[PDB]
Design a protein around this ligand. Structure first.
Ligand code: HEM
Ligand code: A1D61
Length: 445
């Protein structure tokens, strides 16, 4: 076997940590240009064997959990925040069973009501923005998305109980995903660690109360929570309340910040492309209805231009820029054998802005998919939600949430950038959020 082309680090242990923190996408891009598609790293005592390009990423996107173990990478971070016996804590077959049980709930029947729920919530929430002014797009969209995700997934019982205190609790729970989670161990009683732990206990307690109330409820209502409760394991064991709580606080916490940043990025891209925003509003006027009636899942499929805009936003600025895996058996890609112990990586951000196939890589143009383009030509060139075996179980929910939030938002206002300052990428956060998000909005005529 041959080890993959190994980059050389001046620092023995820390490696390229500072460079990756400063500019991960650019660092990966130049490393690709200099050492091919299978260049390796050395970051904090770990070898980050990145796979760039479709051919290299095919290994990660077609690998099995017996070969590329996600748990050995994500357990120490996801177990304390989500719960025990849920998410990545369980073995891989139980994890697959949980994933399919969750995917069963997110169906067309539930989406038909989710569209109306999200439309109502965004129409009510964006009343405070007034006729015109400037606002923090990222935070407002995060607050809207947490409301909509709660109302749709957890149900009216949980949504009604939602207030500023529990919103801050959810923000604190998301605060568990940070640098300290990776570098520092689960031994130090850091105040961030104890905040996350207390938030998880309080959230699970209120969720236990809500689950008991729903179970005792006589009236039958179809929801994600009800579907999870009715559905049992493959063997036949009824789902425990602890497991159900873990499922739902995993679902919502996994879509609150990977959907807020995408919505904000699409908003800024549409503000920069005023002609594209005008075309999108014209579509909202013509294909949904001249009187602009409330949206429905049937009309969602008619918003092809908005779908293309969301696709281009995800291509340029993916929320999840890295999907890590832990090698445990020797694997070969591009002729280079990766020994077990290397943190096999993949970049759903660099994979979509490579100049080899993505022409005008950094140019926002939601018309590329109208013609032939890598997203259809190549297997794993456009992978914002993942592809192959490892995909998001809620990409449909994301495409029905963002395309119902932004449809109403474009129906309401006429977004326009301020001082021509397109927000940059804040690499400090694990999900790259726009830097200083401020937009000068005006009410649509
Ligand atoms: C633009 C929106 C979103 C993007 C780009 C995105 C991206 C991703 C990606 C790339 C993965 C793969 C992680 C892995 O394979 O290790 C993932 C996993 C996941 N996604 Fe999302 N996500 C989004 C929103 C959502 C939404 C709305 C939900 C609603 C349920 C959700 C639920 C999940 C869950 C539970 C996982 C767990 C891992 C798995 O399913 O394999 N995400 N997401
Ligand atoms: C902001 O919270 C997130 C958001 C998105 C994530 O995945 C896209 C993750 C993550 C791992 C992750 C950890 C730290 C990170 O910094 C990160 O990148 C943002 C990602 C993960 O898979 N969650 C869901 C796991 C799960 C599976 C099955 C189930 O039934 C219930 C839950 C964490």
């Amino acid at each position: 076997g041959k080890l993959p082309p190994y980059i050389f680090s001046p620092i023995p242990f820390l490696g390229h940590a500072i460079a990756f923190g400063k500019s991960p996408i650019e660092f990966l891009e130049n490393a690709y240009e200099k050492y091919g598609p299978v260049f390796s790293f050395t970051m904090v005592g770990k070898t980050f064997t990145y796979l760039l390009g479709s051919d290299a990423a095919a290994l990660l996107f077609n690998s099995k959990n017996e070969d590329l173990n996600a748990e050995d990478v994500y357990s120490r971070l996801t177990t304390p925040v989500f719960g025990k016996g849920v998410a990545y804590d369980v073995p891989n077959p139980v994890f697959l069973e949980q994933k399919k049980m969750l995917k069963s709930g997110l169906n067309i029947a539930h989406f038909k009501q989710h569209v109306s729920i999200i439309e109502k919530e965004t129409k009510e929430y964006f009343e405070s923005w007034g006729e015109s002014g400037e606002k923090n797009v990222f935070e407002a969209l995060s607050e809207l998305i947490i409301l909509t995700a709660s109302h749709c997934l957890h149900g009216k019982e949980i949504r009604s109980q939602l207030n500023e205190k529990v919103a801050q609790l959810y923000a604190d729970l998301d605060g568990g995903f940070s640098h300290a989670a990776w570098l520092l161990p689960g031994w130090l009683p850091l105040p961030s660690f104890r905040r996350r732990d207390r938030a998880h206990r309080e959230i699970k307690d209120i969720f236990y109360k809500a689950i008991q109330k729903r179970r005792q409820s006589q009236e039958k209502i179809d929801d994600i929570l009800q579907t999870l409760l009715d559905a049992t394991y493959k063997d036949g064991r009824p789902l425990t309340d602890d497991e159900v709580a873990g499922m739902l606080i995993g679902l919502l916490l996994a879509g609150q910040h990977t959907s807020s940043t995408t919505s904000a990025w699409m908003g800024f891209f549409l503000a920069r492309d005023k002609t594209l925003q005008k075309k999108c509003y014209l579509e909202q006027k013509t294909v949904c209805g001249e009187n602009l009636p409330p949206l429905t899942y049937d009309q969602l499929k008619d918003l092809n231009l908005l779908d293309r805009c969301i696709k281009e936003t995800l291509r340029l600025r993916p929320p999840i820029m890295i999907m890590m895996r832990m090698a445990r058996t020797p694997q070969t890609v591009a002729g280079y054998t990766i020994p077990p112990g290397h943190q096999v990586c993949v970049s759903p951000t660099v994979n979509q802005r490579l100049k080899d196939s993505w022409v005008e890589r950094l140019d926002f143009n939601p018309d590329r998919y109208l013609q032939d383009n890598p997203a259809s030509g190549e297997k794993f060139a456009y992978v914002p939600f993942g592809a192959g075996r490892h995909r998001c179980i809620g990409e449909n929910f994301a495409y029905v949430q963002i395309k119902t939030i932004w449809s109403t938002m474009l129906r309401l206002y006429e977004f326009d950038l301020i001082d021509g300052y397109f927000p940059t990428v804040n690499y400090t956060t694990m999900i790259h959020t726009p830097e200083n998000p401020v937009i000068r909005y005006k009410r649509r005529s």
